[PDB]
Amino acid sequence: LAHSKMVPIPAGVFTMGTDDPQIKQDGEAPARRVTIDAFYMDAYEVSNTEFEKFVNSTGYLTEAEKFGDSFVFEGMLSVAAAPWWLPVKGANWRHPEGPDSTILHRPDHPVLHVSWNDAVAYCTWAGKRLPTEAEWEYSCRGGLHNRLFPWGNKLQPKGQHYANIWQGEFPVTNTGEDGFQGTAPVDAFPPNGYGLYNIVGNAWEWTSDWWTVHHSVEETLNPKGPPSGKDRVKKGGSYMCHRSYCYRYRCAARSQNTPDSSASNLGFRCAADRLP
Ligand SMILES: *[C@@H]1O[C@H](CO)[C@@H](O[C@@H]2O[C@H](CO)[C@@H](O)[C@H](O)[C@H]2NC(C)=O)[C@H](O)[C@H]1NC(C)=O
Ligand SMILES: [Ca+2]
Ligand SMILES: [Ca+2]
Ligand SMILES: [Cl-]
């Protein structure tokens, strides 16, 4: 396993956002042309094993461990956003559903219950950083223009599952049709054109930017988002998403959380300007 490998993301110009927003309240619009300098992006979400190497090196205690709780989706059980999100005492990256759960059987799955601060700590320890939202989105799009997904516009191209999201009736029944009810290994499913895995679906992914929904149509170069805010931007959707209630497994989709937030469907990957 080379689950910390990076890929070179080529320099280019791309259309960020969409003039056909699917969740208008999220500021998916307007479409805008963005220039991105060549950089490196992690091929994989950061895994449990990779995060454990960081904790072993540094002794880092995550925010969820210090607070003593984290959000867990009710459907995984053996001050919430929805009735299916429960603050669970003792839920954290080593104990993803609570104190009696474990990561021993899922070392290669994405690390969960990591806050934005935890993610920055990891990436910086690794000689990396979080990607900006624009870098993330450019990378997600995998060299295609104005597509819904990393691979195109069909959810199941050639009848194949291309990402780990929900099938069935959310939140009561996840059929596991795509092979995974919860997370999948970080190297599951096909890569996109740049070499990236699970950039939509599996775990949500933190980015560096402060959240706003007010964007200019002006062309920009390596944008970093607004200089201030209260929530940081997360991208890509998770194993929970479904067209019926949370259609956020699109590269243009976007959501947010306070930087000290953590949950059972939220992880990250790193980026870098040059190879560490
Ligand atoms: C994190 O550190 C732990 C603790 O030292 C490592 O787990 C140990 O690994 C060795 C070698 O396989 C075993 O002999 C020890 O008994 C393990 N400790 C116990 C009791 O769990 C672990 O491999 C490190 N994690 C990573 C991802 O490198
Ligand atoms: Ca699934
Ligand atoms: Ca993901
Ligand atoms: Cl789009």
Side-chain angles (χ1 to χ4, degrees), residues 1-78 80-276:
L1 298 174
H3 288 160
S4 281
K5 78 187 201 186
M6 307 192 84
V7 301
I9 306 297
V13 188
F14 81 109
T15 302
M16 186 166 183
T18 177
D19 284 336
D20 190 24
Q22 296 303 292
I23 309 169
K24 291 171 177 139
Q25 178 159 26
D26 289 341
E28 296 180 359
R32 57 219 182 257
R33 303 284 289 169
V34 179
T35 301
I36 300 291
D37 285 338
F39 74 104
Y40 293 85
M41 184 72 95
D42 283 353
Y44 310 109
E45 294 152 329
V46 174
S47 72
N48 287 319
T49 294
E50 294 300 309
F51 196 82
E52 183 175 283
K53 289 175 186 173
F54 159 64
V55 174
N56 279 2
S57 175
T58 63
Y60 181 73
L61 197 61
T62 63
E63 296 195 277
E65 289 167 281
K66 300 184 292 181
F67 286 132
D69 63 59
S70 193
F71 279 109
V72 179
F73 167 51
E74 199 173 21
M76 309 304 288
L77 293 179
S78 88
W84 54 83
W85 282 113
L86 296 170
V88 174
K89 291 185 172 158
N92 59 54
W93 74 275
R94 294 199 183 266
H95 301 291
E97 296 87 38
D100 295 306
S101 68
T102 180
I103 52 165
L104 297 185
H105 60 278
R106 44 176 157 186
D108 52 348
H109 288 228
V111 70
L112 302 170
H113 299 291
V114 285
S115 71
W116 187 92
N117 299 300
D118 300 332
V120 169
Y122 175 93
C123 293
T124 56
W125 169 83
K128 303 180 190 182
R129 58 176 175 80
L130 282 176
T132 64
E133 187 188 0
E135 282 173 342
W136 190 103
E137 188 173 316
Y138 178 53
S139 295
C140 182
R141 290 179 179 282
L144 302 178
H145 175 71
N146 197 36
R147 308 308 210 290
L148 292 170
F149 311 123
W151 54 85
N153 289 332
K154 289 278 177 187
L155 179 53
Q156 293 171 74
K158 302 175 164 226
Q160 304 165 333
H161 285 285
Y162 266 55
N164 181 20
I165 63 168
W166 187 282
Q167 300 81 46
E169 176 171 26
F170 179 90
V172 301
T173 303
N174 188 345
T175 64
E177 179 191 330
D178 66 19
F180 302 93
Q181 293 169 310
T183 57
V186 297
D187 57 0
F189 295 97
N192 78 355
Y194 293 153
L196 306 177
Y197 295 77
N198 300 295
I199 193 146
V200 298
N202 213 33
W204 280 94
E205 307 180 14
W206 286 114
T207 76
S208 60
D209 298 35
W210 286 119
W211 171 269
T212 187
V213 295
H214 299 287
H215 329 291
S216 38
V217 327
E218 66 199 66
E219 296 179 315
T220 56
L221 174 60
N222 300 308
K224 287 180 138 59
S228 65
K230 49 192 195 100
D231 304 317
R232 298 286 185 175
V233 181
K234 60 176 188 192
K235 296 280 280 186
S238 74
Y239 70 83
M240 289 168 72
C241 280
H242 193 268
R243 179 73 186 80
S244 67
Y245 83 106
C246 200
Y247 183 23
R248 287 194 184 80
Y249 54 88
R250 294 170 290 117
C251 293
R254 56 204 303 275
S255 192
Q256 80 278 30
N257 275 123
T258 58
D260 60 351
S261 296
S262 59
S264 56
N265 69 345
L266 170 62
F268 64 105
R269 75 184 64 226
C270 308
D273 298 356
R274 278 164 282 101
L275 285 167

